[PDB]
Nucleic acid binder design. Structure first.
Ligand SMILES: [Mg+2]
Ligand SMILES: [Mg+2]
Ligand SMILES: [Mg+2]
Ligand SMILES: [Mg+2]
Ligand SMILES: [Mg+2]
Ligand SMILES: [Mg+2]
Ligand SMILES: [Mg+2]
Ligand SMILES: [Mg+2]
Ligand SMILES: [Mg+2]
Ligand SMILES: [Mg+2]
Ligand SMILES: [Mg+2]
Lengths: 210, 68, 96, 85
RNA sequence: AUACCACAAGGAGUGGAUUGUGCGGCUUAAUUUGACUCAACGCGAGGUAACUUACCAAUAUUUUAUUAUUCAGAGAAGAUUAAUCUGAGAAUGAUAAUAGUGGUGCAUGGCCGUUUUCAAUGGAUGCUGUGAAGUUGAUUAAUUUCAACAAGACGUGAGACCCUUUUAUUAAUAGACAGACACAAUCAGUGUAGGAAGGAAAGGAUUAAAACAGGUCCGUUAUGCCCUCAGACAUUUUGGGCUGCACGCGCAAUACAAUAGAUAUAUAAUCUUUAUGGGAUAAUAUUUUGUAAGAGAUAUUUGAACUUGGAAUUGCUAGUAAAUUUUA
C-alpha cells in the first residue's frame, strides 16, 4: 500500500513538468521528455527537433531551466543534469506538424492551403496515412467542421494504440477559438527505431514451397 | 441579474490619519552651551540609535521588542 | 540482505532477471527468488462533466510488479553488482 | 511599493540564475528571499510592462524567464564604472 | 425480417398504508440554480449546521502601465501596541492591461449523450448511356461466409486483437479445433460420445462514415461580444437560509405473522395458539464529534395506519430471478 503511494506522487510531477515545455519551447519544437529519478543526478532528458540553436548559442535556456527544476522539486542546484538530443524524423512528430499550422494560420493563409501542406510532408516521410480535422468558425456566424483524410488509418482496439499518434491544439483568433486535431499512422519497421516492431494480426504471409 | 446594493445608511467615517511634527527631535534637549542633553532611553541591544517606547509599566523596543 | 525489484511493465523486469541470475548465482554466492502477486488501484469515476445524459462509469487502474531476492553474502560481493548491474528504467532499492 | 533593500534582493537573483520560482499562497513569505507573496507577484507584474521578463502560469505555480532586454538591464544596474585594486 | 427496454408459457413486483429522499406549486426579507416522452426527477459524483454559496440582514480591506495636476524626506505610503522602529512614494483624472459562479451552449472549442445488442463504406480496371450516373435462394449476432450471375479482384468498419475467471505444470507455458461419428451437396445447422471446459469457453473493455441548433459559459489562467469599477456585481467577518407547509408525482427501506416472534446450549428445555405481528410520534435521564446541535449512541415508558392493495405498468431463461450478508 505504501509502495503504490510513491509512484503516484512522481507522476503528478510529470504532469506539471510536461505542460511547461508546451508553453516555453514553441521555438525549437520539442518532441517529448523523459525523467529519471532514482539516480544521484536525477536526469531530465529532452528530445528537441532543433538542438543546434541551443548548444550553438550557449544561452541561459540550458541553465535557467536547470535552476527551476531543482527549486520546484526542492533539491539543491548542481544536482540535476539535463541532456539534449535530436529527433530522428520530423514528419512523424505530430506536435511539430500541428505547431506549423499554428504558424501558418496566423499569416492569413486559408485553411485549405495549410491542410494541404501537412499531407505532403508525411508522404515524403513514409507514413501510410494521416488525418487532419479543422473545426470552428470558418466562414461566419454558423460553425462547422472539415476533415481532410489521406491514406489509410486504423482506429479500433489495442493494435490501434501502437500505430497512431494524435494531438489537440487550439488557435485563438479575434473571433472565437478554432480547434486543430492531427493524427499520424506510423509505418512498420522491424528495427524498432522508426516504428513498432511487431506485425499486424490481420496480414498473414505464406512462405513459398521452394 | 445582480445589481448594486443601495444602502439606506450612510458610510461610517474612518478616523483620520495623524502625524506629530518633529517627533524625533523631542527625545533630545539642546542646551544654551550647544551640548545635547539626552532624556529618552536607548535599549541595551541597540544602544546606538533606537529609543525605548515609554510606557508606564513597560519599556518597549521597536526593533527587537525587549520588555522591561 | 533483502533486495527487491519494483516495476511498472513486465518486459523490464524480465531482462533484469537472466542478467542477474548468471552473474550472482554462478559466480560467488547463493540466492533465493521470490515474486509477489500484483497490487491494483481502483478509481471508479463518472464519465461526463454533467448530470444530463445516461450515467456511465469508468474504472482506471495501475499495476505494480514485485520480485524480491533474499541473499546472504559477504560485504563487497553484493555491492559490486549494484554498480555493475544498474538497469535503466527499473528501481532496485537494496536493503543491506 | 517595496523597499529598496528588498528590490535589490530581487535583481541580484536574476543576474546569477535568471529564473525565479514563485508560489501562489496569499499569506506567506518566499523562502529564498523574504517578501510577502502578494507584494512580490505585483512586483513581477510591473516588470512585464517594461518587457524585461515573460511569465508562465501552470498548476498554481509561476515560472518566469527574463529576456535579453532584461538581462542587459539587470547587470547594468549593479555595475561599478571603475574598480581599483 | 427481427426482438424478454414485444407478446407468448411462467415468477417476483409497482400503483393501496408508514417513512427516507428528488420534482412542482405556494410562503417569506431570502427559501440560489441547470434539466421536462424513450433521451429530466437517490441527476450535477448535490450526504445536515461556519467555509463550501451564487440568496437575504449587517461589517471590514484593496492589481499594473503611459500621461495630466497637487503633494511628499523641515519624513509619502507601512508595521507595532497616544510614542517606537523601517523608510520613498503617494491622492484625484483619462486611455490601456487585470478581476466577475453577472447574460448568451440559437455566437464557439473540448468532453459527452442519443440514433446504435444498427451494418455499412471508399478509390482503380472492364461494361451500359449524349449526360448527371449505374452494376434471386439458403445461412449468420454481423453485405458474416456460400450458389447463380457483365462483372473480376482489393481496402475500411465488424471480425481479428486486449483484460478478468477456470484445468494442469517448469509461472508463463500448454490446453479447443466444431476436433470425432451420424443426419443425401459446398457454406452450414442439430443430435450422441470422450473430456476441467463444445459450439462467440463465461463476462467485460476498445469502437466506422453521418446526424441533433440534444446537454455543458455554475470545472478550468479555454474564449468572442456585452455589463459592472473601490462601504466595488471584487474580497473578508457575524447571524439566517437552500431543509419551510393547504396540496399533485417519480425512485426506494420495513410490514400486514406459525413456512412467524422472544429466549437459549442455536433442535437442552420452555412460552406466545390471534393482533405478545408492527414500529411511526413523543417524554425523562446518561453520553460522542464539533467554535458552535431540532445531529448520532444507551435505559424505561408512549405505542399510529396497516389483516395483501382500483384502472394501469417495469424487469427476468442458470448458479439467472428471489432472499440474507459484506469492503471502498
Ligand atoms: Mg480493423
Ligand atoms: Mg473489435
Ligand atoms: Mg405506494
Ligand atoms: Mg451556508
Ligand atoms: Mg469566468
Ligand atoms: Mg447544442
Ligand atoms: Mg437546446
Ligand atoms: Mg463588495
Ligand atoms: Mg462577488
Ligand atoms: Mg438498495
Ligand atoms: Mg415485536
Amino acid at each position: 500500500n505504501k509502495i503504490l503511494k510513491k509512484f503516484i506522487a512522481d507522476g503528478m510531477i510529470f504532469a506539471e513538468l510536461k505542460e511547461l515545455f508546451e508553453k516555453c519551447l514553441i521555438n525549437e519544437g520539442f518532441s517529448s521528455l523523459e525523467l529519471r529519478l532514482e539516480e544521484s543526478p536525477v536526469k531530465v532528458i529532452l528530445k528537441v527537433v532543433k538542438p543546434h540553436d541551443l548548444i550553438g548559442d550557449k544561452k541561459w535556456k540550458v541553465n535557467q531551466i536547470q535552476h527551476l527544476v531543482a527549486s520546484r522539486l526542492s533539491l539543491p542546484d548542481s544536482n540535476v543534469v539535463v541532456i539534449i538530443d535530436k529527433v530522428v524524423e520530423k514528419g512523424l512528430c505530430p506536435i511539430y506538424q500541428a505547431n506549423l499550422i499554428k504558424e501558418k494560420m496566423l499569416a492569413n493563409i486559408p485553411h485549405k492551403r495549410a491542410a494541404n501542406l501537412v499531407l505532403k510532408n508525411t508522404k515524403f516521410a513514409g507514413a501510410t496515412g494521416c488525418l487532419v480535422t479543422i473545426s470552428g468558425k470558418l466562414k461566419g456566424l454558423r460553425a462547422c467542421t472539415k476533415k481532410f483524410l489521406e491514406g489509410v488509418v486504423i482506429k479500433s482496439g489495442q493494435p490501434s494504440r501502437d500505430y497512431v499518434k494524435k494531438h489537440i491544439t487550439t488557435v485563438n483568433t479575434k473571433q472565437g477559438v478554432i480547434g486543430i486535431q492531427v493524427s499520424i499512422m506510423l509505418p512498420h519497421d522491424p528495427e524498432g527505431i522508426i516504428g513498432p516492431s511487431t506485425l499486424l494480426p490481420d496480414k498473414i504471409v505464406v512462405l513459398d514451397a521452394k | 441579474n445582480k445589481k448594486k446594493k443601495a444602502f439606506k445608511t450612510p458610510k461610517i467615517v474612518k478616523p483620520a490619519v495623524v502625524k506629530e511634527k518633529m517627533g524625533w527631535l523631542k527625545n533630545f534637549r539642546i542646551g544654551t552651551d550647544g551640548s545635547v542633553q539626552v532624556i529618552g532611553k536607548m535599549c541595551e541591544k541597540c544602544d546606538d540609535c533606537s529609543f525605548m517606547r515609554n510606557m508606564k509599566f513597560n519599556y518597549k523596543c521597536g526593533k527587537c521588542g525587549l520588555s522591561e | 540482505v533483502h533486495i527487491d525489484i519494483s516495476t511498472t511493465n513486465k518486459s523490464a523486469i524480465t531482462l533484469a532477471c537472466e542478467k542477474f541470475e548468471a552473474f550472482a548465482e554462478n559466480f560467488i554466492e547463493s540466492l533465493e527468488k521470490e515474486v509477489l502477486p500484483k497490487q491494483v488501484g481502483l478509481v471508479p469515476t463518472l464519465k461526463t462533466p454533467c448530470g444530463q445524459g445516461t450515467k456511465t462509469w469508468a474504472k482506471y487502474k495501475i499495476i505494480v510488479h514485485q520480485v524480491r531476492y533474499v541473499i546472504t553474502s559477504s560485504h563487497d560481493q553484493l555491492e559490486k553488482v549494484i554498480q555493475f548491474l544498474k538497469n535503466f528504467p527499473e528501481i532496485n532499492i537494496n536493503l543491506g | 511599493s517595496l523597499t529598496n533593500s528588498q528590490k535589490v534582493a530581487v535583481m541580484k537573483h536574476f543576474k546569477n540564475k535568471g529564473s525565479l520560482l514563485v508560489y501562489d499562497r496569499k499569506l506567506e513569505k518566499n523562502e529564498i528571499l523574504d517578501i510577502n507573496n502578494k507584494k512580490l507577484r505585483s512586483y513581477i507584474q510591473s516588470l512585464k510592462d517594461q518587457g524585461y521578463i515573460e511569465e508562465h502560469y501552470v498548476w498554481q505555480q509561476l515560472y518566469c524567464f527574463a529576456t535579453e532586454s532584461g538581462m542587459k538591464y539587470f547587470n547594468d544596474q549593479l555595475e561599478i564604472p571603475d574598480v581599483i585594486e
